[PDB]
């Protein structure tokens, strides 16, 4: 798990996201969709977005970004004690949305990228380490639920 010090770093970094949840959420999803176009195809409601300009102009994309980061933030504030929060998300993403764990790896990487892009020189090595551990814990606990369900893709 994460140490008390590491969780403090995670939640400090998270304050940066909370100052502009929609902007961070939008950029995370755009990074995901442009880097990995197959991910867009999982969103029937974003399939029409044929260019990054269209993505940037989509108010619904920003809305979904807010929903995604709000859910993740709730999970992070549990400092690993997130079974009740995480289980339903893992199950909706496997059974309803059909999201392979690879795509969760992609979005985790996108979050790290966006933090550096929006806060260059202000996302230190310690902070990156801690946030990476938190995202890996999130992904890994989802992976355990995916295995329970026998879900791959």
Binding characters for ligand HEM, 22-61, by CB under 6 A (x = yes):
-----------------x--xx-x----------------
CA distance 119 to 78: 25
Which residue of the chain is nearest ligand HEM when measured via CB? 92
| Interface positions, 102-131, toward ligand HEM (CB under 6 A) | 103-104, 107
Binding site listing for nitrite: 64
CA distance 115 to 99: 23
CA distance 18 to 38: 28
Q: Does position 95 bind ligand HEM by CB under 6 A?
A: no
Residue 57 Cβ vs ligand HEM, minimum distance, rounded to whole Å:
19
Nearest-10 Cα torsion for 74, 119, 132, 82: 0
Q: Which is nearer to ligand HEM, 85 or 121 (CB)?
A: 85
Residue 93 Cβ vs ligand HEM, minimum distance, rounded to whole Å:
6
**What is the token pair recorded at 68?**
């995604």
Exposed / middle / buried, residue 79 (Cβ in 10 Å: 0-12, 13-18, 19+): middle
Q: Does position 147 bind ligand HEM by CB under 6 A?
A: no
């Amino acid at each position: 798990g994460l140490s008390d010090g590491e969780w403090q770093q995670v939640l400090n970094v998270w304050g940066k996201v909370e100052a502009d949840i929609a902007g961070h959420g939008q950029e995370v999803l755009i990074r995901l969709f442009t880097g990995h176009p197959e991910t867009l195809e999982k969103f029937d409601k974003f399939k029409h977005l044929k260019t990054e300009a269209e993505m940037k102009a989509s108010e619904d994309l920003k809305k979904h970004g807010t929903v995604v980061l709000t859910a993740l933030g709730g999970i992070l504030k549990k400092k690993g004690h997130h079974e009740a929060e995480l289980k339903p998300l893992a199950q909706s993403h496997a059974t309803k949305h059909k999201i392979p764990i690879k795509y969760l790896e992609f979005i985790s990487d996108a979050i790290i990228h966006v933090l550096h892009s929006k806060h260059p020189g202000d996302f230190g090595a310690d902070a990156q380490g801690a946030m990476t551990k938190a995202l890996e814990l999130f992904r890994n606990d989802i992976a355990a639920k995916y295995k329970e369900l026998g879900f791959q893709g």
